[PDB]
Amino acid sequence: GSSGSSGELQVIQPEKSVSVAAGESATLRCAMTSLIPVGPIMWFRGAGAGRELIYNQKEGHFPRVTTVSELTKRNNLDFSISISNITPADAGTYYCVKFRKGSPDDVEFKSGAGTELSVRAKPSAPVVSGSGPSSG
């Protein structure tokens, strides 16, 4: 009849592990099974231990991070992000944490399984056969 919340929210992590190259743009897929309890989204690499803030929906000037989909819209479950200019020092495992709207600030509610990033060292030049046109 009149039901808005379907079950209990849950961090959906389709991409078990991403694959990119030093200097490429990674795609950390993420989506919740619901919007309740309401709350923003925050990424952290190494959840539980050594967790480093990757992105912050609430605020934060992150140029490298380009929201794959508009979050301003209404009822936007898709919370996937794209970190451009990937580095071999940022690799590891990004855990999509679903923070719940709270005061004075949000509060950790769910923790994504943890998407492992596979940063592939920069590429290399092709087999350089001397300097000159084909001979013999």
From Swiss-Prot:
Identify the keywords attached in UniProt to this record, alphabetized.
Cell membrane, Disulfide bond, Glycoprotein, Immunoglobulin domain, Membrane, Repeat, Signal, Transmembrane, Transmembrane helix
Q: List the disulfide bonds.
A: C30-C96
User: What is one GO cellular-component annotation here?
Assistant: cell surface
What residue stretches are annotated with the Ig-like V-type domain?
A: 8-112
List localization entries. Answer: Cell membrane
| Superkingdom of the organism of origin | Eukaryota
After translation, how is this protein modified? N-glycosylated.
- Example GO biological process term? positive regulation of phagocytosis
What tissues contain this protein? Answer: Detected in monocytes and dendritic cells.
What's the subunit arrangement here?
A: Homodimer; disulfide-linked. Interacts with TYROBP. This interaction results in the recruitment of SYK.
Q: What does this protein do?
A: Immunoglobulin-like cell surface receptor involved in the negative regulation of receptor tyrosine kinase-coupled signaling processes. Also participates in the recruitment of tyrosine kinase SYK. Triggers activation of myeloid cells when associated with TYROBP.
What is the designated name of this protein?
Answer: Signal-regulatory protein beta-1
Report the gene name.
SIRPB1
| Residue numbers of the full-length protein present here | 32 to 154 of 398
